[model samples]
Target: ADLEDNDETGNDNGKGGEKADNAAQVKDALTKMRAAALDAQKATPPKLEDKSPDSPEMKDFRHGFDILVGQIDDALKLANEGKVKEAQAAAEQLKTTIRAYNQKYG
Candidate 1:
């Protein structure tokens, strides 16, 4: 289903030719992921079985949510340490979580 055509996966790939420090690109990617994560945490799961935080579903969701945020912070550290690829890889993994959860939650 093409909402407008040529749109894939709904992610922003940042600028094509910024030519800034690798750290800047890493920061932008992580920051964007962080924004989406925050939105996911604020949303409640739509499934009846997943609605309660004490349920197994929501417990796992919250636990994974914490890890997701923690990994983002660690990836920022990796970026500061000049591990651009490592940080970007973290971004790629962390990026899909919202879409996954939103499929069930939103």
Candidate 2:
């Protein structure tokens, strides 16, 4: 009777352990989804209207543009701070952005 009880308790703990692991995995996935949504929002380029670059939507677009500009500044700051590898990666992204910007709006 004692051994049977111990086995049942052990099995219950095992099941609970699995549930906890699954919940952690789900939480991580949710966190990643949220980060991706935010990144997508930030990564979208601002569209300039043919007539009014300062239109309301264009203003919002400009705000987004400022964000990328800030990212470039941050990369430069990192380079200044001696984080060479990190700065290099960030600068690489900025270079891509500049090239794409010229291609799209130049």
Candidate 3:
């Protein structure tokens, strides 16, 4: 365990899970995401990399959840216009993102 030949640029890559606190946040976000209106809007993931232990992975996963939020927005927009088919399409996208994340990280 004598691994110490590195510079201290203050950034360590992929090596800790102690502060795995975001698990609760992730679950909470998913829960709130499945809820409604402003609730879904506020259901953002935490610093996933901090807890999940992979910056690259969390970065994209965050994007996954990011687009996931937008789908809800799309759903809201279409529903606002009374476009049932369009709105339902967006809703499915939201559900897809959820199942996708849950399958990979649930």
In the order shown, what is each candidate's alpha-carbon RMSD?
11.7, 16.2, 17.9
All candidates in order of lDDT, best leading: 1, 3, 2
How would the candidate models be sorted by TM-score, starting from the highest? 1, 3, 2
Q: Rate the local accuracy (lDDT) of all candidates.
A: 0.64, 0.48, 0.50
- Model 3 residue 39 distance off true place after TM-score fit, in angstroms: 9.8
Ranked by lDDT, the better of candidates 1 and 3 is: 1
Error of 1 at 71 (Å): 0.6
Best by TM-score: 1
Write down the TM-score for model 2.
0.34
lDDT of 1 by residue, 1-106 (tens): 6575454543445455765677766777776657755665565334534456555655646765666678788888877775888777766775576456545454
Candidate 2 backbone overlaps, count: 0
Candidate 3's C-alpha runs over 4 A off are 1-51, 55-57
Instruction: Give the C-alpha lDDT of model 1.
Output: 0.64
Q: Write the per-residue lDDT of candidate 2 for residues 1-106, one digit (tens) a residue.
A: 3557656665525443444233333333333434543453455443332424444544444544554555655654665574556665665676576456434543
Instruction: Give the range where candidate 3 is weakest over 10 consecutive residues by summed lDDT.
Output: 22-31
User: In terms of TM-score, how similar is model 3 to the real structure?
Assistant: 0.42
Error of 2 at 104 (Å): 11
Per candidate, the number of residue pairs that clash is: 0, 0, 0
lDDT of candidate 3 over 4-104, digit per residue (tens):
65765433433255343433223334335546323323344443324453545555455655666666555555665755555556566667666776556
